[PDB]
Design a protein around this ligand. Structure first.
Ligand SMILES: O=C(O)C(=S)Cc1c[nH]c2ccc(Br)cc12
Ligand SMILES: O=C(O)C(=S)Cc1c[nH]c2ccc(Br)cc12
Ligand SMILES: [Ca+2]
Ligand SMILES: [Ca+2]
Ligand SMILES: [Ca+2]
Ligand SMILES: [Ca+2]
Ligand SMILES: [Ca+2]
Ligand SMILES: [Ca+2]
Ligand SMILES: [Ca+2]
Ligand SMILES: [Ca+2]
Lengths: 173, 173
């Protein structure tokens, strides 16, 4: 019902090795955005998709199995509706004054310093963020929240990170 | 003398805001790699160049000033010299067997598991890594080392961070 649609999409998408590569992901996402003329993008490029796959490849197989891919695709789905909803001037892009509302709608309450930092790294010189840049930021933000949580065993708001962990979390990303 | 010349390079490249943007960087890099046929590459792409700038933009102007650019540029020439040198089979790309030597000569000593991750994130399906991916890997690796060391002056092998700090460190990259 729910997951018969989805079980099929995953099987067709993952193909012969039954996992979703960076390329397979790239291609489906560009296919989907083709159908939404209200999402401005210059396309999901390969290195952005390798980075989304790495940050979601928890068992480190190199590729996304069914659960990893399901988690990603349902997020992307929720986040696309948010992008459209908070693009309140229909630029096809999310600008600096739209960005807070959008992020907090996805459950990320950042502060001004952090918002500005995000815009500096993900938005263009006018301070606009296109759809691929938006999704790829969110995937990462979501992963880095969840890696913090996983490390904050005692719920102190402070984590201790050893150099091995640091290098794995930042490089396989 | 080559300090005269390099200031001229910088000035011409940075133009009228006297800083190097990710676009300006992307262009000089692709321009420079065409002179070097032995460096195989599918191009430096805008996302990787935003990432490289962010990683290098210590003073957070969003762009690369003179010292920031020079630092990046000197690493890149050291590393391309290392790339050419460790490509023993002259393939114009760095394979899995050639890789440890090259990272060793850039002075990184990582365990097997970290190598495997890096190869899955940056190399192709035959374990082959091309020049833009190599350079992008090393810029990032170097910066993640320096960020960590900066916060672990005393060599405990651990840093302690809150969520704001963590997000600054892992997203402005
Ligand atoms: O816009 C809609 O009504 C839907 S059902 C979109 C949608 C549903 N699943 C999706 C996955 C990726 C992207 Br981009 C968009 C979608
Ligand atoms: O500039 C040169 O004549 C050489 S031999 C190397 C070099 C000097 N600066 C460089 C910057 C990027 C790359 Br790729 C190579 C170089
Ligand atoms: Ca596949
Ligand atoms: Ca996996
Ligand atoms: Ca807008
Ligand atoms: Ca984009
Ligand atoms: Ca400039
Ligand atoms: Ca700067
Ligand atoms: Ca080679
Ligand atoms: Ca490449």
């Amino acid at each position: 019902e729910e997951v018969r649609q989805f079980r099929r999409l995953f099987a067709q998408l993952a193909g012969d090795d039954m996992e979703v590569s960076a390329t397979e992901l790239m291609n489906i996402l560009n296919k989907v955005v083709t159908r939404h003329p209200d999402l401005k993008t210059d396309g999901f490029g390969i290195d952005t998709c390798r980075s989304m796959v790495a940050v979601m490849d928890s068992d480190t197989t190199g590729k996304l199995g069914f659960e990893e891919f399901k988690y990603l695709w349902n997020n992307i789905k929720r986040w696309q509706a948010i992008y459209k909803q908070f693009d309140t001037d229909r630029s096809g892009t999310i600008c600096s004054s739209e960005l807070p509302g959008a992020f907090e709608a996805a459950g990320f309450h950042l502060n001004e310093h952090l918002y500005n930092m995000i815009i500096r790294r993900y938005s263009d010189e006018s301070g606009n963020m296109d759809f691929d840049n938006f999704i790829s930021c969110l995937v990462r933000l979501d992963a880095m929240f969840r890696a913090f949580k996983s490390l904050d065993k005692d719920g102190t708001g402070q984590i201790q990170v050893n150099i091995q962990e640091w290098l794995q979390l930042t490089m396989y990303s």
